[PDB]
From a paper:
RyRs are calcium-activated calcium channels critical to excitation/contraction coupling in heart and skeletal muscle. Ca2+, ATP, and caffeine are well-characterized activators of RyR, synergistically activating the channel by inducing a rotation of its activation core and pore opening. We use cryo-EM single-particle snapshots of [name] (RyR1) to exemplify the discovery process facilitated, and the new insights revealed by our approach. Broadly speaking, conformational changes along CC1 involve the cytoplasmic shell, the activation core, and the pore; those along CC2 involve only the cytoplasmic shell.
Numbering used by the authors: 1 to 107
Write the structure that this text describes.
């Protein structure tokens, strides 16, 4: 379950394909909570590739459903990343995570 609410400007066609190292200015958020992880805070815009399951499934499926320039808004389900496990100190178990994802990519 990935609910994409794209803020309109972009190109609408440059989709991430397999093995494409793509660039996302991500900015995390918790449902009824604050930020937890931000490439914008690090100013290191997270050059990640598609097809290795490096990123979580809530962040991976949101990438290919966007295009270059687009600014979507992830509402990631708990069961795809940390719903029963939970990260120690960052992500509690059964958290519905929120992301400011703007696909300004490469390749």
């Amino acid at each position: 379950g990935v609910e994409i609410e794209t803020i309109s400007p972009g190109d609408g066609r440059t989709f991430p394909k397999k093995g494409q190292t793509c660039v996302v200015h991500y900015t995390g958020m918790l449902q009824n909570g604050k930020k937890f992880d931000s490439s914008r805070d690090r100013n290191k815009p997270f050059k990640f590739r598609i097809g290795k399951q490096e990123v979580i499934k809530g962040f991976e499926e949101g990438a290919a459903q966007m295009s270059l320039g687009q600014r979507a808004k992830l509402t990631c389900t708990p069961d795809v990343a940390y719903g029963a496990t939970g990260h120690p100190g960052v992500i509690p178990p059964n958290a519905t995570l929120i992301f400011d994802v703007e696909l300004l990519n490469l390749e």
